[PDB]
A paper describes a structure:
DNA transfer is facilitated by a type IV secretion system (T4SS) nanomachine, embedded in the bacterial cell wall, which is extended by a long hollow filament, known as the conjugation, mating, or sex pilus. Functionally, the pilus is involved in mating pair formation (MPF), linking donors and recipients at a distance.
In IncF plasmids, MPF has been shown to enable low efficiency DNA transfer via the hollow conjugation pilus.
Numbering used by the authors:
A (entry chain A), B (entry chain A), C (entry chain A), D (entry chain A), E (entry chain A), F (entry chain A), ...: 6 to 70
The structure:
Amino acid sequence: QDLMASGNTTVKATFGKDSSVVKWVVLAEVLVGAVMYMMTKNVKFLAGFAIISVFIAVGMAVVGL
Amino acid sequence: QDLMASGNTTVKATFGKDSSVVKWVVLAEVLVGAVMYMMTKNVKFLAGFAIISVFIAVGMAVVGL
Amino acid sequence: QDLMASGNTTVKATFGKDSSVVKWVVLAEVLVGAVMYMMTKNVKFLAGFAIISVFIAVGMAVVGL
Amino acid sequence: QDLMASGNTTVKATFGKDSSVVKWVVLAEVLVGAVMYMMTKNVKFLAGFAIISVFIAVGMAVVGL
Amino acid sequence: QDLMASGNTTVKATFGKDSSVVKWVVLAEVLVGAVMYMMTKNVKFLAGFAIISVFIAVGMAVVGL
Amino acid sequence: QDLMASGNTTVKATFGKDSSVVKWVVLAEVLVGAVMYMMTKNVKFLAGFAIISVFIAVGMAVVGL
Amino acid sequence: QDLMASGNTTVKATFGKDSSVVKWVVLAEVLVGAVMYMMTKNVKFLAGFAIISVFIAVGMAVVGL
Amino acid sequence: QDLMASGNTTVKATFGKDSSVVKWVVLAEVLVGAVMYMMTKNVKFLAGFAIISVFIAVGMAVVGL
Amino acid sequence: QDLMASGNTTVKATFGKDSSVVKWVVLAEVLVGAVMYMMTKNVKFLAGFAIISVFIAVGMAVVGL
Amino acid sequence: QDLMASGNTTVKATFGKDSSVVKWVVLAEVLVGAVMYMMTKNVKFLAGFAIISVFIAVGMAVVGL
Amino acid sequence: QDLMASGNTTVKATFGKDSSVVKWVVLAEVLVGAVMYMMTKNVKFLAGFAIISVFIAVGMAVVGL
Amino acid sequence: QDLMASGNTTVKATFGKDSSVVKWVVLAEVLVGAVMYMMTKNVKFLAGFAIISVFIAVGMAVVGL
Amino acid sequence: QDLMASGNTTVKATFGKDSSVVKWVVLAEVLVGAVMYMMTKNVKFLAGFAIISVFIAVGMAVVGL
Amino acid sequence: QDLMASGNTTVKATFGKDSSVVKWVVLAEVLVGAVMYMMTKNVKFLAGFAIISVFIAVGMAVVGL
Amino acid sequence: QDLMASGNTTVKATFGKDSSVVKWVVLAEVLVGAVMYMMTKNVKFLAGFAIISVFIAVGMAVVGL
Amino acid sequence: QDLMASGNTTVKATFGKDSSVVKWVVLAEVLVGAVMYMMTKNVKFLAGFAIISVFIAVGMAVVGL
Amino acid sequence: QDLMASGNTTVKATFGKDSSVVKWVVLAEVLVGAVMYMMTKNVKFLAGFAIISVFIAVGMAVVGL
Amino acid sequence: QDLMASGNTTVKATFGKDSSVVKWVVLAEVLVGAVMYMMTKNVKFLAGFAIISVFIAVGMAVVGL
Amino acid sequence: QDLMASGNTTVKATFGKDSSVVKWVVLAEVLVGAVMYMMTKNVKFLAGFAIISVFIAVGMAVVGL
Amino acid sequence: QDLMASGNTTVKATFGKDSSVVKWVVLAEVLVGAVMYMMTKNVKFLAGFAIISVFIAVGMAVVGL
Ligand SMILES: CCCC/C=C/CCCCCCCC(=O)OC[C@H](COP(=O)([O-])O)OC(=O)CCCCCCCCCCCCC
Ligand SMILES: CCCC/C=C/CCCCCCCC(=O)OC[C@H](COP(=O)([O-])O)OC(=O)CCCCCCCCCCCCC
Ligand SMILES: CCCC/C=C/CCCCCCCC(=O)OC[C@H](COP(=O)([O-])O)OC(=O)CCCCCCCCCCCCC
Ligand SMILES: CCCC/C=C/CCCCCCCC(=O)OC[C@H](COP(=O)([O-])O)OC(=O)CCCCCCCCCCCCC
Ligand SMILES: CCCC/C=C/CCCCCCCC(=O)OC[C@H](COP(=O)([O-])O)OC(=O)CCCCCCCCCCCCC
Ligand SMILES: CCCC/C=C/CCCCCCCC(=O)OC[C@H](COP(=O)([O-])O)OC(=O)CCCCCCCCCCCCC
Ligand SMILES: CCCC/C=C/CCCCCCCC(=O)OC[C@H](COP(=O)([O-])O)OC(=O)CCCCCCCCCCCCC
Ligand SMILES: CCCC/C=C/CCCCCCCC(=O)OC[C@H](COP(=O)([O-])O)OC(=O)CCCCCCCCCCCCC
Ligand SMILES: CCCC/C=C/CCCCCCCC(=O)OC[C@H](COP(=O)([O-])O)OC(=O)CCCCCCCCCCCCC
Ligand SMILES: CCCC/C=C/CCCCCCCC(=O)OC[C@H](COP(=O)([O-])O)OC(=O)CCCCCCCCCCCCC
Ligand SMILES: CCCC/C=C/CCCCCCCC(=O)OC[C@H](COP(=O)([O-])O)OC(=O)CCCCCCCCCCCCC
Ligand SMILES: CCCC/C=C/CCCCCCCC(=O)OC[C@H](COP(=O)([O-])O)OC(=O)CCCCCCCCCCCCC
Ligand SMILES: CCCC/C=C/CCCCCCCC(=O)OC[C@H](COP(=O)([O-])O)OC(=O)CCCCCCCCCCCCC
Ligand SMILES: CCCC/C=C/CCCCCCCC(=O)OC[C@H](COP(=O)([O-])O)OC(=O)CCCCCCCCCCCCC
Ligand SMILES: CCCC/C=C/CCCCCCCC(=O)OC[C@H](COP(=O)([O-])O)OC(=O)CCCCCCCCCCCCC
Ligand SMILES: CCCC/C=C/CCCCCCCC(=O)OC[C@H](COP(=O)([O-])O)OC(=O)CCCCCCCCCCCCC
């Protein structure tokens, strides 16, 4: 008797591991990092996209959708 | 002579430990954390999904539904 | 010559220490706290369910139903 | 020559210090306070049942039934 | 010798668990919630249809028509 | 003996899943979001139309008209 | 038996993909961005008109008017 | 059946490519840059008017008024 | 044998699609919107006359006078 | 057989495009904007009289008095 | 048949281009600017009276009283 | 028919070129500059009273009271 | 054959342009404005007596007593 | 034939230019300003009594009692 | 014929130049200044009691009670 | 006829020159200064208690309680 | 021939300057002010009893009983 | 001939200087201040009980019961 | 003739010097201070429980319950 | 007659010296210190867990639960 069971499918494909939103977030990270590195010359901005990637992976395994 | 005993079943499966609402809350946490980390570069946002998980567990054992 | 003595039983089992209404109130507290913590990142919301629990206990001993 | 002297007994046991109505009023106070605290997070609602209790005591000593 | 026994049938099918009025009430809830969420951006409006559903169920079991 | 059975058809096509009112609500959401994003520059307004869409779907399956 | 079918045409041409309101919103974005960049010298304001454009496109395909 | 078609002309000549407001914005940029360069001696302020100019051009071609 | 058939003509020209009352209502809307926008500076008042117009159209087609 | 046709003339000259009320509204806008700019130093108040002007024009063409 | 034509004269001399209210507004601007410059040492306050002057001029030509 | 013409005299002598308020503002500038120079040893504070003086002069000629 | 012609004189001097009632209304406005300005510090109260004056003038010319 | 001419004298001396009420209003202004300045340290409160004084003067000349 | 002339005496001695309320206000200023200086180490708080004193003097001469 | 004359005594001994509150303020100053000097090694913190002392003296002579 | 002259004495001592009712009103004012100040921390409540006192005095001199 | 003289005694001992109500008000002040100081860390809450005490004293001397 | 004398006992033991509420307030202070010190590293939070303790003592001696 | 005596036990074991919350606070301190030391290389972060420990001890002895 679960009254919100009908939506998982949609959610899983719009906000999920294989979805467009996630790729847009990672693309934004790349561009922000490049623009900041040009202005400050600080190496901490060259790792940005890596730490996010691993993070997202570890996250989606805890939800189990 | 308990007059609201008939509903527990439904409640327990719609708002419970094994329910879709809880997974949607945790998914929202992941996405909010990623978007905030991209804009501020602050590490406090990388722990978000963990502290929530433990919290929910400790909560559902106190209700005992 | 008490004219409302016949109802205590029912009341005590519908609005009492061992009743479904109380568990629904505590469950609502858990869910509200999680949703608020996700949006504000403020630790005051992680204690909610504890303070309510003790409160209810201290209350039901003063009524003595 | 008091023409309403016959009823005190009944009144004293239905609307009195040791009566069911008073316990139902205090129980309602507990429940209202918990539900309001969950929605507002304001501490003024955690004192409700105390101030009522003392109040009722001081009242019943002035009537002297 | 029950003088209003003839009507239950009609009532049970016009104002009952399986009736059109109940579905119209739940539909109104959905639409009101969507319109309010668009104007305020407050999440309390996304739960509306669930709490009503459970409520109606628990109600119709107490009447026993 | 259901006395309001004659109207479902009309209702289902005027206030339903495939109806004009729903599309006008979603269009209003798009426009409100764009105007607010221009003035505040806050990303929470870029998700508006998605969360509403899923919501409506999950709603219309619970009514079953 | 749809009772509001007569208006779509008008709506689609006044609040639509090819309408004047949308162009006025995008023009406002350009001007706000220029005035803010002059006062703060922050590059985040140089992307404004792009993100809005894509957004509107993705929106109008979900409504399907 | 476009109900706001009558205004484009006026808008296009008051808030447009060939309008006085745009020239006042660029003039303000020149003056702000000179005053800031005098106080800080930083070369980033000598490019201000160029980047704005190109920006406005690219903007007005996307609106197509 | 319709006993009120003689009046439609008059009604249709005094309270109708092409009548003076409707234009006075729309004129009042324009003036109220301008006066409110001057005092609050809120954009919701700039759409008033549009939503009314479409509304009236959709209405007069349902009456069919 | 239009029973309110006699008044348009008067209305059109008292509440119209060429009327004193409209000029008083625009004058009030100028003065309010100046007084607010003096106290806050915010540029949004320097555009007030323009947006109103265009608005009124677009309005009076939809009424067609 | 203009019913408010009798007042323009008075208005034009009390709230107009050559009126005392306007001079009091500009005087207030001068004094506010001096007091703020003394406390912050920020040059943006030295232009205040100029931008207001031009503004008022451009305004009074659009009203045409 | 100017309805606020009676006050200029008073205003001109209380908030004017030859008034006490202006001298108090300039005196405050002197004292603030001395106290700041003692703590920072920065020469920009030794010009304060000059730039204000010229400013006030140029201001009072634009008001023409 | 006008049956109420005898009273105009009296009316015109008791409720008229040159009458005591009007001066008492304007005096009340002055006092209310001062008391409100002292408590709120809002400038809208400093214009009160002006707008009323013009209003009364424009009114008495429309009656023509 | 003015029927309320007998009272002006009294009014003019109780609610007038030379009356006690006006002095009490100005005294209240002084005290409110001092108490607010002590708590906020904002200079806008040091001008209060001046602006009121001029205001009252300009008011009493328009009434002409 | 002044109807509130009887109270000046009392007022003048309770809310006046030589009254206890004024001394309590100045004492509060001293204490607030000391406590704030201890926490911030900012010299603007060492002048507080002086500026208030002069202010009160200049005020009481304008009321003339 | 001074209506608040009865309290001076109490005030003068609780908030006065010879009172405990003043000594607690000076003690707090000593402790804050020592803790700050330990962390920054800046000599400006070694004068704190002196400047406060003189200040309080000069203050209490202006109140004259 | 005054037909109600016999009662003044009684009235003057029950509702008068030296009567118990007046003291009860002033006592109520004190208590209300204290309770409100405790809950809001707003200084306007500390003046209550003073303004009432003067008021009553000025009132009883106008009646002359 | 004072008709309410019989009650002063009772009033004076229930609502008076030496009464329980006053002590309960002061106790409430202490507790409210402590709870607020814990949450905000603002020193204004540490003076609460003092200012009330003096206030009550000054009040009871004006009533003279 | 004190009508609320019967309650002091209860009050004195529930809201008093030796009561559980006071210990819960001090415990809350300890926990809040520790959590804040962990996040900010500011020493002002290490004194919290001391200043409250003394405060409560000084308070309970002024009430004298 | 202590009305909240029933809860101490629970409180003492959930918020106490031997409780899980305290250990979680100290664990958080360790982790925050390590992460900060890695990024800044400042030795002040290596003492964190010690100062907290002593603090908590000294606190729990003052409450005496
Ligand atoms: C729906 C369409 C999505 C389209 C995705 C394309 C994204 C392209 C973004 C490129 C922007 C580059 C701008 C930039 O680098 O400026 C630097 C600023 C730094 O500002 P700050 O650190 O000084 O406060 O950086 C910032 O502060 C933030 C600016 C960038 C944030 C906006 C992008 C958010 C999109 C996230 C999508 C969420 C979808 C639900
Ligand atoms: C029923 C369908 C549920 C679908 C669940 C999908 C959720 C996907 C959400 C992704 C949104 C990402 C937006 C974002 O990151 O923006 C950042 C903002 C921060 O705003 P602020 O901190 O500046 O005030 O973040 C915010 O402030 C909050 C924005 C996100 C909150 C909306 C999500 C709430 C859904 C909870 C479901 C409750 C169900 C009863
Ligand atoms: C009879 C069936 C009971 C079913 C119980 C299931 C409860 C599940 C509730 C989950 C709701 C989550 C919504 C949420 O978190 O939104 C946050 C808002 C906060 O609003 P605000 O602070 O901005 O004013 O939060 C709020 O403001 C309040 C929203 C939640 C209140 C509704 C729940 C009340 C049920 C209490 C039952 C009483 C029974 C007599
Ligand atoms: C004879 C049988 C008695 C049974 C007693 C059981 C009582 C259980 C009550 C639980 C109700 C909880 C509902 C609740 O908390 O909602 C909050 C509202 C607040 O409304 P508002 O503040 O926004 O106006 O709260 C309210 O506004 C008031 C709602 C509660 C009032 C109804 C209870 C009155 C019973 C009193 C008995 C009198 C007997 C003569
Ligand atoms: C017999 C045919 C039934 C047809 C059912 C279709 C229902 C469709 C309703 C859609 C209406 C949407 C309007 C809306 O969302 O406006 C918001 C307002 C909120 O007003 P407020 O909160 O500001 O006071 O919302 C409101 O305040 C209430 C407006 C909606 C209430 C009217 C619907 C009641 C129908 C119930 C049927 C009962 C049958 C016995
Ligand atoms: C029947 C014809 C329907 C036609 C549909 C076209 C809708 C087009 C709407 C475009 C309006 C844009 C205005 C806007 O963005 O202003 C922002 C405001 C925000 O106000 P606030 O947040 O500051 O209180 O936003 C608001 O607060 C709300 C303003 C918009 C609400 C009005 C639209 C409601 C239509 C819903 C239709 C219901 C049908 C039953
Ligand atoms: C119907 C005729 C439409 C005419 C369209 C022409 C638009 C031209 C607008 C140019 C305004 C430039 C002003 C400006 O840049 O000031 C900056 C402010 C920023 O304020 P803030 O960030 O400090 O709160 O910016 C703001 O905060 C917002 C100010 C701009 C908002 C007003 C424009 C809204 C028009 C939207 C049309 C909706 C139609 C339904
Ligand atoms: C309608 C008439 C328009 C007249 C146009 C003439 C503009 C002349 C402006 C010259 C101002 C020079 C002042 C200056 O350089 O000071 C520097 C400050 C920097 O402040 P900050 O960086 O320290 O926060 O700079 C600033 O922070 C901003 C100060 C300048 C902003 C005001 C100009 C805005 C006019 C835009 C017109 C919009 C029309 C809708
Ligand atoms: C026949 C003799 C006439 C004597 C004329 C002398 C008038 C002197 C009036 C001075 C009253 C000042 C009181 C005041 O300022 O209080 C403010 C209140 C505001 O109340 P609110 O806004 O909070 O609802 O303000 C108000 O709300 C209204 C209070 C004032 C209204 C009473 C005056 C009406 C007289 C009009 C004469 C009509 C003759 C037919
Ligand atoms: C008939 C006898 C008249 C006696 C005149 C003596 C007046 C002495 C008044 C001194 C009061 C000082 C109180 C004070 O400064 O508190 C500040 C508050 C501010 O409140 P807020 O801004 O936070 O809403 O300030 C306020 O909000 C308003 C409080 C003061 C208003 C009351 C005085 C009104 C008297 C006007 C006389 C009218 C006669 C018709
Ligand atoms: C009738 C008896 C009068 C007794 C007079 C003795 C006054 C002694 C006051 C000493 C209080 C010291 C408290 C203090 O310094 O705290 C600082 C706060 C600053 O708060 P903030 O700036 O952070 O908002 O400071 C504040 O924000 C304000 C706190 C002080 C305000 C209360 C004193 C008002 C009394 C005025 C008397 C008016 C009589 C009508
Ligand atoms: C009623 C009992 C009074 C007991 C008096 C004993 C006072 C002992 C205080 C010792 C505290 C030492 C703490 C310390 O030095 O920390 C440094 C901080 C500096 O903070 P910041 O500069 O980084 O913002 O310093 C601060 O920022 C401020 C912290 C100290 C302020 C609290 C003391 C105020 C008491 C004043 C009494 C007023 C009575 C009405
Ligand atoms: C004949 C015996 C008289 C005995 C006199 C003793 C009076 C003692 C009164 C103490 C009551 C304290 C209660 C209190 O402070 O509560 C605050 C409320 C405020 O309510 P609100 O502002 O939120 O609407 O305050 C109020 O709203 C009003 C509550 C107080 C009003 C009742 C007192 C009226 C007595 C007047 C005597 C008239 C005799 C003809
Ligand atoms: C007859 C028996 C009397 C018993 C007296 C014992 C009193 C004990 C009270 C302890 C309550 C502590 C609660 C507290 O501190 O919460 C803080 C709130 C602040 O709320 P806010 O500022 O956010 O609106 O604080 C408040 O807003 C107000 C809450 C406290 C007010 C209730 C106490 C009133 C009793 C007055 C007695 C009057 C007798 C006629
Ligand atoms: C009846 C049972 C009582 C049980 C007592 C146990 C208390 C344990 C409390 C531990 C809470 C720790 C939470 C915490 O430290 O979070 C920090 C926040 C700071 O918030 P902010 O400064 O950012 O606005 O801190 C806060 O802002 C406030 C959060 C803590 C306030 C809630 C505790 C109040 C209880 C008082 C009892 C009154 C009884 C009448
Ligand atoms: C109920 C389950 C509890 C689980 C306990 C496990 C705690 C593990 C925490 C590890 C987090 C490490 C994150 C970190 O080091 O980031 C550094 C930031 C510094 O931020 P800032 O200084 O730049 O403002 O650090 C911060 O600013 C603060 C981030 C850490 C604060 C969150 C932990 C609070 C838990 C307290 C429990 C209270 C229970 C009532």
